[PDB]
Structure 1
Amino acid sequence: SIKTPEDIEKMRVAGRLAAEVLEMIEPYVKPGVSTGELDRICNDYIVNEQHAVSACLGYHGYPKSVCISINEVVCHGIPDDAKLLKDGDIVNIDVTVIKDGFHGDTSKMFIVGKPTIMGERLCRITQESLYLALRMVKPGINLREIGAAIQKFVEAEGFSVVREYCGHGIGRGFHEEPQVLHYDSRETNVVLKPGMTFTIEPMVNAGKKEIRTMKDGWTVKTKDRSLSAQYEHTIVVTDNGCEILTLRKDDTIPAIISHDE
């Protein structure tokens, strides 16, 4: 799927909105706030201000507008009014918006209250793994290299990479081809071409890689109950690199990454 100059522009709009939801919610992510209220804030904003729609809601029956995962929760945490954030917590807020027919998908970690050493480190190393992978993207390279480089980096830090979930192609469809694994796999055989749009979203655990799913059909936790973090960005392969469509002001990497010169 090679997006056209116009479709790419739409992806920029959808990606920007997704990223802006994360920038907007930051001030609300504090101790004592419930994940349920954070969700309502994000939804009212997406609908009433961005004039877009959450792609998560209803997707395979997902009940909320955004996914919020805390500490040992790996992904797909469901916003709840009874779940309050507290100091030391590391929280992922996963956002997916649909606008003008195109999707914008992204997520980041938030450290609540006073940070713990492992909390700050895990999140930091996880973002560094995403950035390292991003700096690699450019026409010609094979997706298998990006996944191999992520796993290599993360494991040398003494952490592990989650296997059950992966990045994905994205466009008029929420999840399109190809699959973007965050570890080395002999199945990956894709040569990036300019115009391609997909996501990179590594999930990293402080302990072992195994993840156990809960009895609600969604919530995934680490088997050993160790902390797990994830960061996600949607990108578009440019002629000499890539462009991050969901870049935020707090990101410390440039929107456009060039390689030719």
Structure 2
Amino acid sequence: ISIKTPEDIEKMRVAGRLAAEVLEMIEPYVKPGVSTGELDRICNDYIVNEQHAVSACLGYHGYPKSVCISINEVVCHGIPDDAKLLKDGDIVNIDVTVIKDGFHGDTSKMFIVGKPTIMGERLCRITQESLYLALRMVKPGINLREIGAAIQKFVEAEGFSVVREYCGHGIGRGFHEEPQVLHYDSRETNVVLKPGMTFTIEPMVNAGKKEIRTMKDGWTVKTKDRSLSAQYEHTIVVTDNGCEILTLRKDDTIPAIISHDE
């Protein structure tokens, strides 16, 4: 597994901040009646013309848009569409990845449009809380297995399920690098964290059953039972005594630097 230098890590601070700032920028546009196609153009224009960066998703394995915008029962990889309008009660993930100065920053959050439904709000909250509990566990010497097991235990106790596919991932000069960061317990996982590892945690949580389905368009992933699904993602670096969140936003309610030292 690659170990980032202080120079590499500073570049990941910059890229992570940019990816966060896309999400802070787009918020006032996420309203009933807006199209997801429009949101994607606003994001790409900002990334290119203001941040002077590029979207990692655009063209990636042929993907036609710059961000992924996933609504309701869509689990991930929702394709921005000029005809797809947001409406009251929708839960919406926007997942951003930018490359700046050769390094990637990858982050997503949920937006609830108009008046929340109670179940949508709870699903989003439990999903963020599962990410936060995982972030609290990251420090050198901990095994990724312990973190995946903990996300799953927490989510399942709420009556929700964890998507097994699409895991978190190492990240740096490459969009996806070792390790795989599973959001569930597996005997295969034996990665003892070391300072300078950079990776994402990005749990997808379904209100219903865990199983998923890819649509005929070749991209869009939905819950098999058409239950709601939510995701949040941060890029982090492991430090000598904990971690540092590289994609933190003003609306996050966890500190950027988490220290396990007395």
What do you get for the CA RMSD once the two structures are aligned? 0.3
Cα distance in 1 between the residues matched to 2:141 and 2:162 = 25
In structure 2, how many angstroms separate the alpha carbons of the residues matched to 1:232 and 1:61?
23
Shift of 1:139: 0.3
Q: Deviations over 1:205-234 (max 9, x none)?
A: 000000011001100000000000000000
Matched positions, count: 261
Distance 1:27 1:237 in 2: 33
Q: Once the 2 structures are TM-superposed, how far is the Cα of residue 164 of structure 1 from its aligned partner?
A: 1.1
Measured against aligned partners, the alpha-carbon deviations of 1:100-150 in whole angstroms (never above 9, x if no partner) come to 000000000000000000011000000000000000000000000000000
- CA drift of 1:33 comes to 0.1
Aligned-pair CA distance for 1:187 = 1.1
Q: Which residue of 2 aligns with 1:127?
A: 128
Runs in 1 of length 4+ with deviation above 3 angstroms?
none
> Percent sequence identity over matched residues?
100
- Residues 149-192 of structure 1, C-alpha deviations (whole Å, 9 max, x = no match): 00000000000000011000000000000000000011111000
For the residues of structure 2 that align with 1:100 and 1:153, how far apart are their CA atoms? 37
- Distance in 1 (CA, whole Å) between partners of 2:120 and 2:158 is 14
Deviation per CA, 1:71-97, whole angstroms, max 9, x where unpaired? Answer: 000000000000000000000000000
Q: Distance in 2 between matches of 1:191 and 1:71?
A: 35
> How far is the alpha carbon of 1:195 from its aligned partner?
0.4
Match of 1:74?
Answer: 75
Other structure's SS at 2:94 match: strand
1:13-57 C-alpha deviation (Å, 9 max, x unpaired): 000000000000000000000000000000000000000000000
Cα distance in 1 for partners of 2:90, 2:20 equals 22
Q: Secondary structure at the match of 2:83?
A: coil
* Cross-structure match for 1:42: 43
Q: What secondary structure sits across from 2:255 in the alignment? A: coil
Distance apart, 1:10 and its partner CA: 0.1
Give, in whole Å, the separation in 1 of the partners of 2:102 and 2:213: 34
Work out the CA distance in 1 between the residues paired with 2:217 and 2:179.
28
TM-score (norm 1): 1.00
CA distance in 2, matches of 1:47, 1:165: 27
Q: How does 1:32-181 map to 2 (within 5 A)?
A: 32-181=33-182
2:206 & 2:57 partners in 1: Cα distance? 24
Whole-Å Cα distance in 2 between the matches of residues 154 and 116 of structure 1? 19
**Cα deviation, residue 260, structure 1:** 1.6
Q: Give the whole-Å Cα distance in 2 for the aligned partners of 1:138 and 1:62.
A: 35
Aligned to 2:20: 19
Structure 2: where are the runs of 5+ without partners? none
2: distance between equivalents of 1:20 and 1:136?
Answer: 25
Question: 2:61, 2:133 → 1: CA distance?
Answer: 32
Q: Distance in 1 between matches of 2:46 and 2:103?
A: 18
- Secondary structure at the aligned position of 2:137 is classed as coil
Offset from partner CA, 1:53-77 (integer Å, 9 cap, x none): 0000011111100000000000000
CA distance in 1, matches of 2:64, 2:140: 38
**3-state DSSP of counterpart to 2:190:** coil
